[PDB]
Amino acid sequence: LSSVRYGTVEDLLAFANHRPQESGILLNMVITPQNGRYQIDSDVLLIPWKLTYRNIGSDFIPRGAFGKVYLAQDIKTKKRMACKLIPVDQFKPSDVEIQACFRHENIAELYGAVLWGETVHLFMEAGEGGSVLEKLESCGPMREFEIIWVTKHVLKGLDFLHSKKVIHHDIKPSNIVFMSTKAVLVDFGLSVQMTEDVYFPKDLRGTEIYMSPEVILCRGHSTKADIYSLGATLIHMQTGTPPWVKRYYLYIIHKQAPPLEDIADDCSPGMRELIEASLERNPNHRPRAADLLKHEALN
Numbered sequence: 189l190s191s192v193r194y195g196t197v198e199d200l201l202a203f204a205n206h207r208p209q210e211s212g213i214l215l216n217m218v219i220t221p222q223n224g225r226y227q228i229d230s231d232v233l234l235i236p237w238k239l240t241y242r243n244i245g246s247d248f249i250p251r252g253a254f255g256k257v258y259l260a261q262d263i264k265t266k267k268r269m270a271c272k273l274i275p276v277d278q279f280k281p282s283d284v285e286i287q288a289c290f291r292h293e294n295i296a297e298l299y300g301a302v303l304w305g306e307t308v309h310l311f312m313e314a315g316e317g318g319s320v321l322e323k324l325e326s327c328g329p330m331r332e333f334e335i336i337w338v339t340k341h342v343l344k345g346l347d348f349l350h351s352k353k354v355i356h357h358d359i360k361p362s363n364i365v366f367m368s369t370k371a372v373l374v375d376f377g378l379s380v381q382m383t384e385d386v387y388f389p390k391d392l393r394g395t396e397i398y399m400s401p402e403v404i405l406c407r408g409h410s411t412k413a414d415i416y417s418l419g420a421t422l423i424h425m426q427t428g429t430p431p432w433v434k435r436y437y438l439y440i441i442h443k444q445a446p447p448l449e450d451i452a453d454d455c456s457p458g459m460r461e462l463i464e465a466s467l468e469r470n471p472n473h474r475p476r477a478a479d480l481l482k483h484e485a486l487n
């Protein structure tokens with residue numbers, strides 16, 4: 189590939205596994221190339237993100253160390269997309285694989301991938317309302333209704349991913365971004381598709397605070413790992429502060445689990461039953477995303 193052209197998922201995945209010019213594969217017709225190119229200020233305009241609860245704007249949102257998300261607008265279709273910049277050295281096929289193959293209303297759609305210089309630009313669905321972490325940080329504890337609303341979206345994302353035998357591996361407030369009508373799941377960098385009933389990891393993956401005990405133990409886990417992470421995300425959404433942090437992490441988590449003490453006194457018995465169910469230590473006794481959607485607290 190020497191130019192930016194429209195292609196299939198198979199073309200995108202082949203490019204991902206594979207001189208000042210730009211090359212790449214566009215999956216959605218929303219991204220407009222002109223003469224096998226996609227240049228800034230000529231084809232796409234990089235607009236700032238709106239920090240709703242801060243009355244200011246931001247050119248980009250920092251995502252770890254080897255990631256920054258910009259807000260791009262296709263000058264032709266006027267379509268707003270998020271633009272994630274991942275350097276070639278730190279670029280993994282997992283960053284495109286799940287989003288290219290599996291499309292769902294509650295998974296941020298990958299529109300295209302463009303390599304320019306030493307960085308890979310991933311154009312995808314822009315959560316213009318921001319991340320669940322941004323709301324919590326700028327406002328504090330969320331209201332029970334907003335919690336129920338967001339969770340019903342995430343659970344519909346996870347039920348789909350787990351039906352495809354996929355473990356996200358990083359469900360946290362930071363990876364739940366939202367729009368006016370819905371919330372989408374982001375960051376598939378640590379994602380993995382299960383080949384068997386149990387997944388055996390080679391290294392510890394995820395964010396310590398939201399990690400399940402079975403993940404920290406490294407003996408074996410499944411899609412149930414995401415359910416615990418959602419429970420940990422829920423206690424952060426409910427209290428406004430992440431679990432463990434207030435009381436006190438790998439040693440503390442492997443011994444004490446779940447952090448049921450971190451659940452606020454204000455919490456409703458319905459939501460508390462949902463949070464406690466999702467945080468169940470035994471993965472076998474922990475509910476599926478499909479099961480939790482049927483819970484009284486959500487419906």
Ligand SMILES: Nc1ncc(-c2cnc3ccccc3c2)cc1-c1n[nH]c(=S)o1
Nearest residue numbers: 237270313314315318319322365374375
């Ligand atoms: N598609 C996206 N849409 C939105 C965001 C985002 C995150 N935080 C914000 C905070 C404050 C304001 C806006 C925000 C927007 C991140 C992405 C994204 N995709 N892949 C990864 S990793 O990040």
